[PDB]
C-alpha cells in the first residue's frame, strides 16, 4: 500500500500541489471575469454567480486542506513520528479530497462545488492521479483497525503539536472526563443550565483568562493553547467549550478596542470568571446582515438609553455584561452608524432572569440541549453609562467587532473539531461493543468506513485549525485560513454526528445515548456564529482581491 | 436546433440510457467476479467488498431513477403536459444524477459510490455528456421562480398520476392542512400521543382499510392510492402517515398468510379502525439480524406462552394486536424456527399502558416528536390463543413477513416523499417571507438552489415510488424497485430537511418552527424500517442473481 512508504507519499503530494494551486488560480480568474468584468466586483453579478463564487471558496478550502495535511505529515516525518495510522490518514485524505476536487465537493448535501461550475477542466498529472486512487478498501479497513487499537491516545493520529500543548490537552481531557461527560445527560434531562460549579472550576483553572495578558490577570497563553482547551471542553459538551470562547472573544474585543481605563476595569474580572459575558448582536429581523441592525442607543446627558429587540442570545440570564451592538447615528442604515457597548447588567435567577430596569426577556425552546440557554431580549430605555461605550468614540463598533473575527472563526473550528471527535469516539465505542450477525459492527465495512472517514476528516479540519492559530500566534493576517477551518470543520462535525448515529441504529435516537444530543450540537455549528453561506461569501470576496 | 427543449431533452435521454445500462451490467459482472468468483456468492467476500457491493446498489438506483424520470416526462409529453417546471426538473435531474454517476453518488455524507470502487471507467457519449451539463445556474433560478408561482398545487410539477389518484391527493392534503398541520406543535409541546380523534377521523375516511378488499369491509383501492394517502398524511406529520401504514401492512400479512377464519375475524376490524396493530419484531440485542431473535413461544395446551424482550415498538400502548415474531423451535438459531402471532392484547392508558397479564413495558425517551411513541416490552408467560398463530402452522413466520416487504418498502418511500415535500414547502415559505440584505432570501442562489434541488430530488423519488406501486398493482415482482425507492427517498428527505433548516438560520432550531421537528422525523427514515446499509445489501444480492 502507498502508506508503506510514507516518504514517497509525501514526495508525490509535493509534486501534485502546484497543479492544484494553478487550478485555484484559474478558478479565481474565471470568477473575476464573471463578477468583476470591468475590474470592480458588481453586487448583482456576485449574487447571480453565488454558486460559482462559493465553489471557489470550497475548492480553495480543499487545496489548503491538502497543503496542511501534507505539511502535518511532513513535520511528523522530520520528527520520526509519521507512523502507520498517520500515513494511512494521509493516503486516504489525499485520495478522497483529490477525488472530490475532480468529482464534486459537498457544500451541503445537495450542492456540489464542481470544476464545471466555473467552466474549468483538470487533467490530473501523474502524481495527482496516483494519489487520487488512495482511498481504498484495504486502507480504510486498516485505519479502522488501528483506531480500535488506539487505546491510550487522545486523537486518531498524532497531531504534531508540541509537548506543552499536548499536556494542556491531557489536562482538559481529564477535566471533561471527570466533570462534564458523566453529567451532561443529567443536565439535559433536567433542562438545566451548566452548573455554576463547573464555571467556578474552569475559572480556577484559568480558562476564562487563558489568552488575556498577565498584566490583566490572565495566563498570557497562545491562541493554539486556547484551541486545544476548547477542543477538549467541547468534546465533553459544546456549551462548556463555548463558556471559554465567550470570555476569550469579549476580552479580545476590549483589548483591541477599549480605552486603557476599560481594559483595567473589565479584563481582570473576565480573566477570573467574576465577570461573565455574552454577545448581544442578533435581532428578530437582522442576523446575517448585522450592519443593518435596528436597536438604537440615544444620548441622555453623558450616558446612553437603548431600545430594541435582540434574540438568539446565549447565556443571557447569568451574565454580568453584554457586548451590545447598537445604532448611535439615526441617519444611517449601515455598519457605519454602529457603536459597541459594554452593557453591564445584574445577573438574574430562574424566576427573575432580567431584573435590570429597561430589560425583559424569555428563554427560546431549542432543539437539543443548550446548556447556557438562548433568549429573546427586549430593551426599553435600558441605560448604559457613557464610560461603557467601547473605545469612547461612537461609530467604531463594527470595526471593533471585525477585529475579533479571526479568533471567533478559529474558536468555532475548534468547537467543531471537539464535537466531531466526540461523535467519532461514541461511534467507535458502539461499533465495537454492539454485536449483530455474530460479530461486532466494526467488522462491516459500512461501519468501519464511516469511522475511518471521520478520523481522516477530523485530522484535516484539525490541521487547518492549527495552521490558522499558528498564523494568528505570529501576528499574521489569517482571516481566510480561519474562515476555511470554520467552513470545513462545521461540515465535518455534522457528517461525523450523522454517521455515528447511523452506527447506533434505533438506539441513536434514544436520549439515553449521547449521540442524539451530539447530533443537535453538531448541527448548530454552521449557523450559530454565522451561516456557512455567508462564510463562503466572505472567503470568495477576499480571494478576488 | 436548441438542445434544451423538451423534445431535445427526451431524445437525448433516450440516446444516453443504453450506455448507463451497460455501465450497470459491467458493474454487476465486476461485483460478481469479486464476491462470487466460482459462482456462489461467498459471505466473507461479500463482507470484505461491502462498499463496492453497496456502490452497485446506489449506481443501479441512479440508473433506474434516470429511467423513471425520463419515462415520467415522456408520458407527460404524450398528454401535452410537459410544461416548463417539469422540463426543468427533467433537465436539472438528468444533469445532476449523470454528474454524480461520473463523480460520486453520496451513500452517506462521507461515503461515495464511485465507478472506481468497481474499477470501472466511463467516457460519456455525446448525448450523456450534453445532458450532464444541464444543472445550470439559470435553470435552477428559473425553477425556483416557478416554484414560487405554483397556484396552491400540491406538488412542484405534475405527477403524471391519473385523475382519480389526484382527487385522493386533494382530499388527504385538505385533511392534513385542516387537522394535522395546525395541531402538531401542540401535540409536541404536550408530549402526547396523536389524539384518538385523529384516529377516528382517519378511520371514517377509510384509511385503515384503503387497500383491504371490499368483502372484508375495506375500500379495495390500489397500492398507488395508498401511496398518495400516505404521502399527504406524512406531509402533515410522519406519524399520521404511519398509522395508515401499520394497518396496510398488518392486513397484507393476514391476507397473504392467514387462514380463511383469520381473514374473516381480523380484516374487518382493521379496515374500520376498531382494531389497531403494531409490529413486534425488534429485541434489545437483535434488530437487523431478525432471524436470530430470541423471544420464545411455547405450547400450553391449545395455546402458546411467550417469554422475551422486545424494543423500539411503535404505538404499543393503544394497540389491540401485535404482529409478534417469536421462536417456536428451541433447537434453532435462524429464521426457520420463527412463527408469527396475531397477539391480541388490551389497550392501555397513560397510567397503566400494559394491563394485559404477562406483559410489561415502558416508553423510550426519543429525540423529536414521536406521536405513537416507542416502547420497551417484556413478555413473561404472555398468553396467545392457538387460533392466533398466523396460518396455523409453526415455522412460517419469516416467509409470511417477507410477503409484506414490497409494500413496506413502498410505504416507507411514500412517507419519505411526504416528509421531503413538507421540508421543501416549509423552506419555500420561509425563503419568500424572510428578508435579509433588503430582499427575500429566495433571491440568493444558495437559498434558491437548495429549494430547486429539493423539487428535483422529490420528483425523482416520487417517480421511483410510483413505478414500484405500478408494478405491484399489476401483480409483478417489485422488491428491487421498491427497495431503491426506499433507499433514495430516505436520503432525499434527510437532505431536504437539513437544507430547509439551513434556510431558516437560527430559527431553524426553535421548536416554534416546524422544521426542527421535521429534521428529526426525516432522520428516522433510513433506520426505522431497517437500516439503509441492509437495504443496500439486499439490493446488491438480488442484482447478483
Ligand atoms: C444556538 C445559537 C446561539 C446563538 N448565539 C448568539 C449570541 O449569543 N449572540 C448573538 O447575537 N447571536 C447569536 N446567534 C445568532 C446567530 O448569529 C444567527 O443565527 C446567524 O448570524 C444567522 O442569522 P439569522 O439566524 O438571522 O439568519 P438569516 O440571516 O435570516 O439567514 C437565514 C439563512 O439564509 C441564508 N442566507 C442569508 N443571507 C444569505 C445571503 N446573502 N446569501 C446566501 N444565503 C443567505 C443562510 O443559509 C442563512 O442561514 C445564535 C444562534 C444560534 C442558533
Ligand atoms: C422510531 C423507530 C420506530 C421503530 N418501530 C418499530 C416497531 O414498531 N416494531 C419493531 O419491531 N421495530 C421497530 N423499530 C426498530 C427498527 O426496525 C430497528 O431499529 C432497525 O431494524 C435497526 O436495527 P437495530 O436498531 O437493532 O440496529 P443494529 O442492527 O444494531 O445495526 C446498527 C447499525 O449497524 C449497521 N449495520 C448493522 N448490520 C450491518 C451489516 N451487516 N452490514 C453493514 N452495516 C450494518 C447499520 O448502519 C445499522 O443501523 C423502530 C425503530 C425506530 C428508530
Ligand atoms: O509556510 P512556510 O512554508 O514558510 O513554513 C515556515 C515555517 O513555519 C512552519 N509551519 C508552516 N505551517 C505550519 C503549521 N501549520 N504548523 C506548524 N508549523 C508550521 C514550517 O514548518 C516552517 O518551520 P521551520 O522554519 O522550522 O522549518
Ligand atoms: O414496456 P414498458 O414498461 O416500458 O411500457 C408498458 C406500459 O407500462 C407503462 N409504464 C411504464 N412505466 C410506468 C410508470 N412508472 N407509470 C405508469 N405507467 C408506466 C408504459 O407507459 C406503457 O404504457 P402504454 O401501453 O400505454 O404505452
Residue numbers in the entry:
A (entry chain B), B (entry chain A): 7 to 551
Provide passages from the article that reported this PDB entry.
The methylsuccinyl-CoA dehydrogenase (MCD)3 is a member of the flavin-dependent acyl-CoA dehydrogenase (ACD) family. MCD catalyzes the oxidation of the α-branched (2S)-methylsuccinyl-CoA into the corresponding trans-2-enoyl-CoA thioester, mesaconyl-CoA. The enzyme plays a crucial role in the ethylmalonyl-CoA pathway for acetyl-CoA assimilation in many α-proteobacteria (e.g. Rhodobacter sphaeroides, Methylobacterium extorquens, and Paracoccus denitrificans), actinobacteria (e.g. Streptomyces spp. and Frankia spp.), and possibly spirochaetes (e.g. Leptospira spp.).
Here we report the high resolution structure of MCD from P. denitrificans (PdMCD) that catalyzes the unprecedented α,β-desaturation of an α-methyl branched dicarboxylic acid CoA thioester. PdMCD forms a homodimer, consistent with our gel filtration analysis. Nevertheless, we also observed electron densities at the surfaces of each monomer that allowed the modeling of the adenosyl phosphate parts of CoA or its derivative. In contrast to canonical tetrameric ACDs, PdMCD possesses an additional ∼170-amino acid extension at the N terminus. However, when superimposing the PdMCD monomer with the MCAD tetramer, it becomes apparent that the N-terminal ∼170-residue extension of PdMCD structurally mimics the dimer–dimer interface of MCAD. The cofactor FAD binds to PdMCD in a “drawn-out” conformation, as observed for other ACDs. Both subunits of the MCD dimer contribute to the binding of FAD, which adopts a “butterfly-like” conformation in respect to the isoalloxazine ring. The carboxylic acid group of the substrate could potentially interact with three arginine residues (Arg-252, Arg-376, and Arg-421) that are all in close proximity.
